[PDB]
Every structure is written in C-alpha cells, then in structure tokens.
Design a binder for these strands. Structure first.
Ligand SMILES: [Mg+2]
Ligand SMILES: [Mg+2]
Ligand SMILES: [Mg+2]
Ligand SMILES: [Mg+2]
Ligand SMILES: [Mg+2]
Ligand SMILES: [Mg+2]
Ligand SMILES: [Mg+2]
Ligand SMILES: [Mg+2]
Ligand SMILES: [Mg+2]
Lengths: 118, 233, 207
RNA sequence: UACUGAAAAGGGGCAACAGAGAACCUGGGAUUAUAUUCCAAAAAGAAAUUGCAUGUGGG
RNA sequence: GUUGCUUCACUUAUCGAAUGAAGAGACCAAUGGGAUUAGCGUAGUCUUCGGGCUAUGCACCGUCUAGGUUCCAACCGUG
RNA sequence: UUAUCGCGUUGUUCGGAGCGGGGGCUCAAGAUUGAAAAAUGCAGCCAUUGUUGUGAGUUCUGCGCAUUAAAGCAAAAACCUGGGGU
C-alpha cells in the first residue's frame, strides 16, 4: 500500500474465515453391520462354477454391480472366515456382476461351499 | 591479516546490470473506480464554474472553523441513554406527584437536520448557520446561502460534513443552526458571528458574481512559460 | 438473384487465411525507455522462411531491461543479414544495414525499410520482398520527415518514427515465369482459397 | 500444533480408441464356448513397474 | 451591447495507436498558484466596520544533477 | 605436418578453418559368452531323435538432418542435463 513494483494492480490478501459444519441433513438410521449382505448377493451353481471349486479352489458369486474388488474381499472376510487371494470380475450381458474368488489354499473351497449349502 | 570486505557497486545505466525494483505507482493500471475518482477532480478544475457552485470552494479559515466546531460540540444534542434517563426521572417525579408540571423540555442544544434547520432559517430563530461544503448530491444545500442572505442570517461554509457529524455525535451532518446559548458563551457567539459575517455576508456582491475553474495543469503551465521565454524578441 | 462471390467472401467461412504453419507476426521491438534514450544490442540467431511470405524472417535475441531473462524478437530481415550479426536499436545507433534508428537521425537520400507511419506502431510500410522507401527531406520546425514510398507516392511522417536501414530480402521473385497450373496451386496453398478464377461472363445471370 | 500471510501479468473447461503417451513374456493334457486376462507353492514359470513402511550399508 | 461567418493559438469532451497502461513534466521559473502555502507594502475604490475588490511590487510554494570547461566558485548542458 | 597434390563413394566431394600414416577416446547397430533353458516344445515308441552351411527377397536400421519448391515439411504434457546460488 506504499510502493507498487508491478505494472498492474492485483487484489490484496485479506483474512478469510473458514466455513462451519452444519447439522446433518440426512437422519436415516443406517446399520453398519449389514452392508456385506448388500455386497454379496448369492452364489452360482453352473457347470463351469462347479469345475472351478474343486480344481482351482475358487468360488463364484453374483455381487452388486457397483462394488469393487477391495470391498468384495472385505465382504468375503466378514461373511465367511476365509481369506481371498484373488478376485476377478466381469459384467454379464444381462447386466449383473459376477466374481471369481480364489482362496488362499489354507482354506478349502469345497468345505466352504458345503457350509454355504451349495 | 587482511579483511576481504569490499565495495562492489553496480551500474544501473541503459544496457547494464539488472536494476532494482522501481516504484511504478504513477504508471500502473489502477482499478476503474480509482481512475474515475481522480479524473472527476481534474474535470471539475478545468471547466468554467458558475458562481452558485463556485461559492462552495471558498470556505471559512482554520481558526474560526475550529472555534465554531468547539461551540457546537459543547451544545451537542443528548444521546439515547441520556434521553432515557431524563424521561425515567420525569416519570418517577410524576409518579410521586400526580399533580404539578413535569417540564419535559430537554436541555438547550443545537438544531440538527435539514428540515428543522430550514424551518429555523425561515422563521428567523437561528442566530447562526453552518453548512458543509461537500454534500453529494449538491442540490440538497445549494440554495441555503441564498436563503440565509435573504433573511439576513449569519452563516458560514466549512470544510467537512464528517467533521460536523463528529461535533454533533453522528456520522454526517449537512448543516447545523444555533438559535440560543447560555449566558457564559455570549461573547464567543458574538465574536464568531463577527468573523463569519466578515468572510461571507459582507461580501455578497463579490460572491454572487465571481466565477471559478479555468485552471491549467502544471505541465501546460510550464510549456506556456518556456514557449514565452523562447519566443522573446 | 443469388449472392455474388465477392460479397460471399466477406462472411469469412472457407476463405480465411491458412495460418497453421506460420510463425507469429513480424514486428520491430517495443518503443520503450531504452530505445527513447539510449540503445539496445541484440544478436541474430537464425534466418528462416515461413509459408505464404516471400521475404526471410530473422530471430533476434535481446536482454530483458527489467528482469533476468532473454527476449526473442521476429523481424523481416533486410538483404545481407547473417547469423551472428550484432544489431543496434535506439536513439544513438550507428548507420549500418540492419540497425533501427529514429527517422530524424538518418541523413537525406538514405534507403530504409520497415518504416512505421506513426511512432510506436512497430513497422507497417515497405515490408514486401525487395521493397524500400527513400528519405527525401527533414523539417525541424514541425519535426516531420518526407518519404517516397514503393508505390511512388509521397508521405509525411513524424520524425520520431523508426525505420531499419537497408532493403527487404528476397527480391526479384516475380521475374521467373510460373509455366504450370500446379505451381500456382502450390503458391496459393500457403495463402488462402482464391484460385482458380472463373470469369464472370462464363457464369449465369442468377449469380 | 493447526493457524497465519511474502513472491509467481494475461479466468474455468472440452475436442485424436490411426498424432504425442503407455511397467509382460513364453509353455500348458487349460473350455462345449474366454484367454499376452485362466494355471498355485516346484504358483509351468521367468520378469518389469508404482505407492507407503522395515532394516542393512553409506550421508 | 448582441448575433453570424471566419483566422490562429490552446485542452478537458471525443476520435486513432501502443503497452504486461514500465520511467510524464518541472526543478533551468511565469502573462502561475495561496488565508488550511495570500504573508507584507503602494494607489484608488467599497463595506453589513469584522474586512474586501482592482492594479502594480516584495515574499513564499523553489530543489538536486552526469558530463564540458576555467582549490572554491561561475558558465554551458539537461537526466 | 600434406599441395600442383593426395584421400573416398554406385552416386552429384573432402583437406593448413588440419589430408594421409602410428597410437587412442566415444556413439549407433550388430556379434560372441553365459544366466533363463530343458525341467520346455515336436515326432516315432520307457526309451531314441534332435542341424549346421550358402544364394534370393524383404524398410527395421544405417547411409544423420541438400526430393519439386514463388511447396522448404505441427504443437504440448511429461522427462533429461547444465549455470547459479542454497
Ligand atoms: Mg476386467
Ligand atoms: Mg485466422
Ligand atoms: Mg454455361
Ligand atoms: Mg441480375
Ligand atoms: Mg481431452
Ligand atoms: Mg496413438
Ligand atoms: Mg495400456
Ligand atoms: Mg472363439
Ligand atoms: Mg528411405
């Protein structure tokens, strides 16, 4: 405000007060213990799926089509006490998302399938 | 054994060392409102100004200005708290005495506000009137010296509506009128009236005819002087 | 009727300049304090050709007057300019081919190019290849210089206008016959959509 | 410890599945139909590359 | 005393150009300003008696310089 | 230390502004060792086999950046090195 050393005037720097966090506008009760049930829908029992259970230690599921691989892994850990080493996904021509899930060979996919009921 | 401290000056001539950062204020691009508020003053200086508007650039001196502002300050109007306290005391007096007058006149003070000051001038109650010289729009007070001259009321034009507002306790005042003072300030008011009359009322013939403006810039004046000197002979 | 072709060309449309391969506009440097009071020294860095233009262009490097950096200028080169040459621009500059001087310092009878009609417009007259202006006379009472233009007209300009000494390079370009329609095709490919030309009597009354 | 406040002229964005850019290769007895995408600890195997943390040497 | 036409010298409306609005003009002084930078004389003239207006002087705003010459100083010169 | 003279291409050229010879320094493209890798693949049938040379054609690449030309052959992100001071 005394001696300017540029050929054009630019806006001076003033004090800015940060905004406040308002009370939330969404007050619907959402349980945090049921999301895995939305993520993992049900298994598949086709011939290819059956062939993968025994020889590749792999299970096949229909999942929510907006889910990603990391959350599918976490949902597997929550719903069944198993550890997935690999998740592969595809979106079918009828619109549903399918997941091929390989277990860590310290668990038996056949025994997990028996417990699931398929 | 030998200090290695030395002078290592720089050359700032054309085509030499990179210069220090100079001050560019007089040659920079400013904001539009800055540029316009300077050019407005220049244009008001260069044009021919009629007397009715020119009279507002001829103000009262410094000493009389300060004295008059001091008098107005000592006769300033009462504030919100003071009015409330006085009215509450009047109310308790009336409560204890359902009879008897109450005398709710308020202490003597100056008259403030354009409507009330105009009324005091027109009814010839004002002993002296003070007018600010920078009211915008100027038509609000442009006629007041003529009214005061017509009614033979002493008046002055002073430098700031902000200073008048400070004297009376507000942000701004366009004009102020003194109608009466205490017995101790009579001499002050009389001397102030004499000086004010000397400057304004007693020079009405000049004030009504004198024009203003027509002021060249310094660069134009210097050019004219140098040309006159050059063409001598 | 229907719109005539000469009027249609004013809409812009498919008749604008083919500019994608061009370098920038060619100008002298800005008339600043150093040029008004002293002089500046630059170095010629390269000589190049641009599509659509017969004359050669020169990239010239100067030092920035206020900051620590280098400034590159692009000018229309006079005949004889070479890479590595030193160029002087300003009030006190010697009479040599390629230097830039105020018109009031150039002796009568001298040949100039890149002349600005008004001071500080950075060069507008005598720019096409092989062209130049001649300085006729000065007038100190009114500070004005008289020039003979390439067209043969005379013009008076303020004596504070600048000009480069010499002649635009690339002269003699129009003296070689073209001989082929394809050569004209390649010549106008770098300029704009104006060739071939159909005679008006070969058209129909509607247009 | 967030906060706070010196420098840096020329607001924000879109437009190329043939331009620029781009860290992975072969073998398979591995399908009815997909694969440089699948194969399980002898990963049939051999690599390259990004982020963040351990420790070993040096600053 | 007004009005029209018209010459010339000006600059603040307006118009053209340049630039990242990047160094304008003075200080070298008036046919210049001032009571908040009009302070003081001289003559006439006016006054609401407090002081004005006109004319002409004196103050003040008033200042620094590379170089070229002849320790200072001065004359040139003009950033 | 060369000179009318020497060096070189199929080809339109190079040299006291440093030719040629003797010794070196670098860059590009190949080659040759190994590791990977026989544990693989192929073909006859718990065993056998297991390939090395010459022509021709192919645009990667190199011939570094002289095709007509009044035609002279995009840009930026991202990245690399230096000059300065830290
Ligand atoms: Mg996929
Ligand atoms: Mg265009
Ligand atoms: Mg016809
Ligand atoms: Mg017709
Ligand atoms: Mg895009
Ligand atoms: Mg591409
Ligand atoms: Mg990719
Ligand atoms: Mg197929
Ligand atoms: Mg080729």
């Amino acid at each position: 405000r005394k001696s300017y050393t540029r050929p054009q005037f630019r806006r001076p720097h003033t004090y800015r007060k940060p905004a406040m966090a308002k009370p939330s506008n969404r007050v619907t009760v959402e349980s945090k213990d049921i999301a895995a049930f939305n993520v993992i829908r049900y298994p598949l029992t086709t011939d290819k799926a059956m062939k993968k259970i025994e020889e590749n230690n792999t299970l096949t599921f229909i999942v929510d089509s907006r889910a990603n691989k990391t959350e599918i892994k976490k949902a597997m850990r929550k719903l069944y006490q198993v550890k997935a080493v690999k998740v592969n996904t595809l979106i079918r021509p009828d619109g549903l998302k399918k997941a091929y899930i390989r277990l860590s060979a310290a668990h038996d996919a056949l025994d997990t399938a028996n417990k699931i009921g398929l | 054994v030998a200090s290695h401290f030395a002078a290592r000056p720089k050359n700032f001539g054309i085509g030499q060392d990179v210069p220090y950062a100079r001050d560019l204020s007089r040659f920079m691009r400013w904001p539009t409102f800055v540029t316009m508020q300077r050019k407005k003053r220049v244009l008001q200086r260069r044009l021919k100004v009629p007397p009715a508007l020119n009279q507002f650039t001829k103000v009262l001196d410094r000493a009389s200005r300060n004295e008059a502002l001091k008098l107005i300050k000592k006769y300033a109007p009462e504030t919100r708290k003071a009015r409330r306290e006085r009215l509450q005391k009047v109310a308790e007096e009336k409560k204890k005495d359902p009879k008897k007058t109450v005398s709710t006149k308020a202490p003597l003070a100056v008259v403030t506000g354009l409507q009330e000051v105009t009324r005091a001038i027109e009814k010839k109650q004002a002993r002296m009137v003070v007018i600010a010289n920078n009211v915008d729009p100027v038509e609000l007070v442009l006629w007041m010296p003529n009214l005061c001259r017509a009614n033979k009321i002493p008046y002055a034009i002073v430098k700031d509506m902000a200073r008048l507002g400070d004297a009376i306790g507000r942000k701004t005042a366009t004009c102020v009128a003194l109608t009466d003072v205490n017995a101790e300030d009579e001499a002050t008011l009389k001397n102030l009236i004499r000086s004010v009359n000397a400057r304004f009322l007693s020079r009405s013939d000049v004030i009504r005819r004198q024009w203003g403006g027509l002021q060249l810039s310094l660069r134009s004046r210097a050019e004219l002087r140098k040309k006159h000197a050059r063409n001598a002979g | 009727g229907k719109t005539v072709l000469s009027c249609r060309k004013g809409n812009g449309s498919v008749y604008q300049v083919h500019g994608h391969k061009r370098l920038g506009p060619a100008k002298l440097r800005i008339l600043d304090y150093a040029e008004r009071h002293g002089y500046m020294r630059g170095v010629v860095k390269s000589i190049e050709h641009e599509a659509g233009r017969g004359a050669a262009l020169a990239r010239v490097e100067f030092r920035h007057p206020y900051k620590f950096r280098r400034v590159k200028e692009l000018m229309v080169a006079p005949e004889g300019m070479f890479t590595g040459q030193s160029v002087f621009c300003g009030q006190k500059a010697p009479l040599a081919i390629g230097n830039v001087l105020p018109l009031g310092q150039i002796t009568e009878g001298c040949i100039v190019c890149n002349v600005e009609a008004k001071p500080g417009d950075r060069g507008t007259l005598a720019r096409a290849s092989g062209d130049y202006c001649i300085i006729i006379s000065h007038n100190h009472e009114t500070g004005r210089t008289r020039l003979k233009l390439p067209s043969g007209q005379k013009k008076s300009v303020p004596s504070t206008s600048r000009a480069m000494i010499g002649i635009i390079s690339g002269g003699g370009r129009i003296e070689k016959p073209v001989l082929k329609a394809g050569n004209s095709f390649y010549r106008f490919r770098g300029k704009r959509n104006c060739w071939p030309k159909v005679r008006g009597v070969a058209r129909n009354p509607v247009e």
